[PDB]
């Protein structure tokens, strides 16, 4: 494989998004950590998948509603950003208030 | 695509060209296998393998670096010799020579 | 006897004529020539030729290499050639035909007893990379950077400070002192730039004589036509470089005034293209002039689909704007320009741009410059074919150009050439190790002053180190005391007699800059290109000699997606 | 010109009368005082204010500070303020109005060329904290206490050894020795206790003369009226602190007779109310006495519904007891009373109690302290309301009452205050800096002797470094030489005398231990309460001047699910 | 007063008569002595024995053990007993009866303030293993190797490098240099073999000068006549130990002719069985000499159903050998005959192979030494039952004559001996702490030279250390400068002389090699018998005496499954 | 639990292989590192089920073809190689040309 530290770092946040992916199954409303890793997660797929950073800029405010996650939480998240491999190479994804 | 892929252009390679070489006739009387490496000095080679040592004497064997002549037990064959080169001083195997020539 | 090309390929690697496609791009090398004689080819292995008396001399250690990397396929700027390298006191010792001097012909590279092997049959050699555009806010950028195929890292910062978030100034004498201390612990050469904003040369002076190889002009601290002389005066006397980031704003004047301040005076422009910083839109006409060494950052290299939608809120972040602020967002649309973002790959391809960089973390991706040199060398084939240069069917002479950009030249801009930055004996065994399908994207192995430093390794516990699961480890050449002994902390002339390391109780092998001033773009290799260039200020349109200079941008690009797990 | 106050706190901060709420609590502070002058703020970034000849003078290093944390909100015991900070060599050296004082007015901190720049601008910054009850069971408990805000630990331990697991002893002079040699591989400040329960002074002495700061009489090793008199014995000799677990099964006598032993000696009473261990079931009685620094170990802070059932087999484990033995179960309900756990919070809340720690894995959550300290603070706001010595709408009496818990006050109890402690000129750069939004959670930035150590970083190859995963990096300040001159070994001044530096080769800045044995439950920062309290013997009732001292378990708490994953 | 066996043996451990199941397996273990008076028995805990006056004395530091280990079940060559076991200066102190003198009966080992405490009270206590088979392919092996309960490592290498990949050779005085400084990082004892394929003796002298411990010669190198007893000549004179690898080509000769030029001097032959190389089919039969010292590596312990199918692809790739290479394969079934890898499992049993090691990442898997060798007697006892020496029903001598092979031996047929390699007084204290449940799989604690190095911990931020998740990270024995002052860096007498330690700035402690020239296969503890051993060239048969050895392969293996995440 | 290191290590190439799953899944066409970690767990609990290294050695070659990854991928593993613990110990499974 020789994954490099930084496919072994994104390994962290894929499964940090395993555990709120099970939570949320579970009809509990996200915290803070547990937000960010999903919304995370969910553009990483979608870099891998092809979809352009314009496209994921917008489906990313579209994973988590204010309704499921505990209060306060959608104001302690301005933004959430992470980078991925997409067909053209690494790129960064700023998604502006994820959760509305 | 292949990543990586060689384009190896078609063709031989000669080797050890412009050197003395002989063929021998090697018979193997020992009861276990013996394998001979591309660079050892022949002439030093296990005991159990018949052959001429004098003619083999400041040679190896005539094949490409890093293969090898196997001999199972009680088999013959001839071989080819090409002789060793740089400074011609043999120094090792079973310590027949440790010098030049 | 006689061998096929095929099996001979297969057993010693490619030879003359054969070519090699570079990973998973366009771009194929033909080796131009072999320095072996055939048949005595040294490899190691159960009953291989690197044996006693066969392919291994009676000779003292003093009388032999101590490292001896077998069939390697070299690829540098002076040349694509097949050889065995010899390597002795952790420096580069030859580059000819290794073994036994005894019964073997022409060898210069003698094996013996103390000497170690390493297998580079089908493998691709090169020297290690060399970033000249590090800010450390993180010391965590050296393993990544190392892993990459970055051996040396030139920057400056002190950590995750505002500072340092958007420059590479590691500010004062305290600080300088602590991170040249904290260096001793990366695997990495390493030299710190300070804080060249002041209209005060004692200010400048003082960061000189604590460590400094040089100094960075941003505009956050102020890029000034005072700051900038000032600057440029203290280097003119202590033989150290400047790098620059020029006033973006044109508040106190345009490139032309910037240029001016410069007065001809050798410097090291950052970013030349813009988008990471410099005169809106124009910066990049530096490149045009004789005393000026432009490099690019990565993150525009090379020009793709997604590249706009990505820099708006980059730019942000890196230096500390207020998108709620008209002025502080006005100014994106005016660093981020289609126009220029599109020429930049071009005139890398004309060796217009000298050199590329990563700007770590601050508009930069510290593990992807060697990475994105190569997939611009791939787009620039693809849209505008072979270079007025090429001779043969292969893209030999675009590889040595491209392959300098982030060696030699940059080693060259910051007068530390004659320690590292080529495959040249002499200079430090700073080495990596590629296989052909991998190159430019994960190396087989990382050699650092002559010890491997990092490479990867499968399950700790098995039979053997080849089982999964294989990531990158640190290796002995990284290790504690071994570690100082294959690594080069590089002072100023001025630090290097004041007593500095001795001081400060430095372990690592000490190494100092000198040439910095006298180095002109005619001497950046392969690419001394000094094109006549224009930006139209309206249209921000690039011109060369009229001509319009532009590419298309990739939707698709190779050494990405095929081999990264995220 | 004019700006509105909303606009102005989201550019440089709150100011003057507006109010922060402390993380998710019910704790809100309000800015008593703005050293700033209106209008001439520092703030860093591209094109901001400081830039050379601007905000940024020609002055030389030694005439500008090193680093300067711009537009902070400070929270200490002295006051809630805004101001910059300035840090040179390590130390705190100014707070006040940053700038350059060739174009600004009132510049009390002077930025030049040699500043490194933290902006600091809508977040809090306080003291690191001081954890005086570490039981080294393991290297990795410095990163996690780290990581929390705990800049300082003191305590004792050889590694996971049954001794270790129970006590904080690191006992005599070889392990005192190994253990002060290994301290110089951590990123934190450290004292080290020896094994004080001997009847024999020169068993003590040699521990004392080896380099520890402090000894500690455990009831593990034999809490007797003779081992305690023993130990303040040499203490009061060679000025270092006695902490003290005593006889919980009333073996040698009852509290009073262990308040006897003492003498109205100065000595630091471990987990004072009594689960951790002390006199069943009315140790808590100690803390009305003049002499006796009192403190509470987190797991009790605050009382909450599982408190209790939590810790019947948390005990067992800590000191080596049998579930199977009756004689070692049996005096669980005497040190697990509900009674004394509900008390604590209140005594806390009051002034009588004077010092949080952890009990770092033996019976203690290393990671915890100031979280749970602040957990008690919002509990106490919300059932007892306003302190008698609130001003104003806000808790700030109440946040300066707390805060001291875990930082000034640890100081004065082990004499080490003269360098840690709070945010003082002349005394270390321990700082951290928090979001308001994780104020007492988790930390922006953790800064240790004047360089960065450990903060939360992003991809490492990413353009930026706020890119996902973000988690805890070791920085800078934490890597070999930089971290052994950003970090502090206490000594002993007897062992400082010996040379004992010198000898183990130490190579961290060392400090000496002093006033250990002057201060008294009256120097206590804010909780020198001294009440008139009474434990009844069979229903366990605490009393306080004839009044029943009590509080409910809560049920949900501010900084828990909210903020962590796990 | 009185109590019951059982009851006894819950509080204190086993006693004389009981006997123990190891792991899961089924070999038993009896106690034969216990030093303890009964009712006298030390324990640590609250309200224990070890308490000021009772338990523990007022001796000084200079009187009284640093760390004592109470209670424990020693299992060594010597003896299967109950004592406690005295550490002080890093090294074993004594093996007798802890306590005070002042109130205690025959106390031999002393407790004072300056005493640590282990709880080993039903526990099994062994010496650390000792590997001297280990390839430094990469630094990770020391700690998986220290894990599993090994804490001194012999070998050679200098990274992944083709020449480590294949050989425990150290080539030459640079990279012999650079391991030895590189060694000072990790936590285990270290002693470095160079390469002794050579016809010139001043090549072997300058690496023996340069620090190296032993020579190998390996058939990759070319194991000539003539390099073996040039090996032999300088190793008689240097007293350093040789390490052979024979030709398996039978290319120089047979196995009788490698005999010839060993002349009767001292050798440790290398996985004597062949599997992992020797001369093709016979070189087993080595084991009957006298100067022959007969070792294992552990891919072929036991004798399994998946053994064979496994071998076929790890023997290229650690040799660098070609599948399509007919000469490089034919040679498979030749070194991997079912027939010796059958009997080598009996030859163990009999005390014929007197060693076991890895052979790590090269036909050998580092963490599993240990592991394996008690598969083995698990195997033998089960197919042949009881050894002819056994007494009382209990597998007592069988645990004897295997533990020494991986303890006393190895120490003994390098020189080491007098530093490690048993638990005997004067000796530097590098013990294993197991459970009965997880002996030989996974260590309760591993400590080195008197301070543990590493353990399992649970939940760093837990009220105790049991909490999950709980699995193997460094201690205090592990950092920094308390590493160094805990394991040692075992030179030639000729290095010590030479001042190599203070050229190169070793930070560890120094020990020195001696009586390698001297050993002989009677000196094996256990392990000395000389069988009349012959192999028939065309089957394959190994006979002793005649009669046919062999074994069956197990489907099921104890240590394996139960224990193992993956 | 007591994990040793290469538990620890082993963890990461099951969690690699969770990722290449989950990917396969949708469809896409599995890449380099996405390959070697989706036949090198299989192997693993092969072997945790008790199969005989004989028999992974011949079904690791049918997880997945030359159609379900990317362009060039089956050139890039030669074979593949794991260790596990199978009832008989810790054993070698070497897979040849995995990917037809």
């Given amino acids: ?100 | 695509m292949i990543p990586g892929e060689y384009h190896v252009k078609p063709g031989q390679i000669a080797l050890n060209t412009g050197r003395a070489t002989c063929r021998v006739v090697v018979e193997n009387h020992g009861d276990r296998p013996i394998q001979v490496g591309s660079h050892y000095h022949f002439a030093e080679v296990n005991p159990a393998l018949k052959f001429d040592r004098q003619q083999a004497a400041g040679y190896r064997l005539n094949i490409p670096a890093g293969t090898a002549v196997r001999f199972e037990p009680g088999q013959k064959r001839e071989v080819e010799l090409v002789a060793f080169a740089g400074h011609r001083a043999v120094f090792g195997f079973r310590g027949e020579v440790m010098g030049p020539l | 006897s006689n061998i096929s090309r095929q099996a001979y390929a297969d057993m010693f690697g490619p030879t003359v004529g054969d070519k090699v496609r570079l990973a998973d791009t366009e771009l194929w090398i033909e080796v131009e020539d072999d320095l072996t004689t055939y048949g005595e080819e040294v490899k190691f292995g159960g009953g291989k030729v690197i044996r006693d008396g066969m392919g291994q001399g009676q000779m003292l250690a003093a009388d032999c290499v101590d490292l001896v990397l077998t069939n390697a396929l070299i690829v540098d700027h002076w040349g694509i050639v097949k050889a065995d390298i010899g390597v002795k006191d952790g420096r580069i010792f030859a580059i000819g035909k290794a073994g036994n001097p005894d019964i073997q012909p022409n060898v210069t590279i003698p094996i013996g007893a103390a000497t170690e092997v390493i297998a580079a049959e089908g493998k691709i050699v090169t020297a290690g990379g060399i970033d000249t555009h590090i800010h450390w806010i993180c010391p965590q950028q050296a393993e990544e950077a190392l892993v990459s195929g970055v051996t040396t890292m030139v920057g400056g910062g002190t950590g995750p400070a505002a500072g340092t978030h958007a420059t590479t100034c590691t500010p004062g004498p305290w600080y300088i002192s602590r991170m040249l201390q904290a260096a001793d612990s990366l695997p990495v050469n390493i030299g710190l730039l300070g804080k060249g904003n002041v209209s005060q040369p004692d200010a400048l002076r003082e960061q000189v004589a604590a460590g400094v190889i040089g100094l960075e002009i941003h505009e956050d601290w102020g890029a000034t036509p005072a700051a900038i002389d000032c600057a440029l005066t203290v280097a003119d006397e202590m033989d150290i470089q400047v790098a620059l980031h020029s006033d973006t704003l044109n508040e106190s004047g345009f490139v032309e005034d910037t240029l001016a301040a410069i007065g001809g005076r050798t410097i090291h422009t950052f970013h030349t293209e813009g988008a990471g910083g410099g005169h809106a839109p124009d910066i990049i006409t530096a490149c045009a002039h004789p005393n000026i060494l432009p490099s690019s950052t990565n993150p525009t290299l090379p020009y793709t689909l997604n590249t706009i939608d990505e820099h708006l809120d980059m730019l942000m972040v890196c230096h500390h704007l207020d998108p709620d602020i008209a002025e502080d967002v006005a100014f994106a649309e005016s660093r981020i320009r289609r126009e220029t973002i599109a020429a930049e790959d071009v005139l890398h391809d004309l060796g217009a741009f000298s050199l590329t960089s990563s700007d770590s973390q601050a508009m930069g991706r510290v593990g992807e410059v060697i990475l994105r040199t190569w997939q611009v060398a791939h787009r620039m084939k693809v849209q505008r074919g072979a270079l007025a240069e090429e001779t043969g069917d292969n893209d030999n002479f675009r590889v040595k150009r491209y392959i300098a950009k982030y060696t030699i030249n940059p080693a060259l801009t910051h007068g530390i050439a004659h320690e590292v930055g080529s495959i040249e004996v002499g200079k430090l065994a700073d080495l990596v190790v590629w296989s052909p399908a991998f190159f430019g994207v994960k190396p087989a192995t990382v050699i650092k002053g002559g010890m491997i430093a990092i490479a990867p390794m499968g399950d700790i516990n098995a039979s053997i180190p080849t089982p999964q699961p294989v990531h990158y480890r640190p290796m002995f050449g990284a290790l504690g005391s071994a570690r100082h002994h294959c690594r080069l902390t590089f002072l100023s002339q001025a630090a290097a007699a004041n007593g500095v390391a001795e001081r400060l109780n430095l372990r690592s092998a000490i190494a100092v800059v000198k040439g910095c001033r006298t180095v002109q773009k005619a001497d950046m290799v392969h690419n001394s290109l000094q094109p006549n260039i224009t930006v139209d200020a309206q249209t921000y349109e690039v011109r060369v000699d009229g001509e319009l200079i532009t590419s298309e941008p990739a939707d698709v690009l190779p050494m990405a997606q095929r081999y990264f797990l995220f």
Avoid at chain 1, 18 to 47: D, H, Q, T, W
């Fill in chain 1, 1 to 100: 494989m020789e994954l490099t530290p930084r496919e072994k770092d994104k390994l962290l946040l894929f499964t940090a998004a395993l555990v709120a992916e099970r939570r949320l199954a579970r009809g509990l409303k996200l915290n803070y950590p547990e937000s960010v890793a999903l919304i995370s997660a969910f553009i990483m797929e979608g870099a891998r998948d092809g979809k352009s950073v314009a496209s994921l800029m917008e489906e990313g405010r579209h994973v988590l509603t204010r309704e499921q996650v505990m209060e306060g939480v959608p104001e302690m998240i301005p933004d959430i950003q992470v980078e991925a491999t997409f067909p053209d190479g690494s790129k960064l994804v700023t998604v502006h208030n994820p959760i509305i």
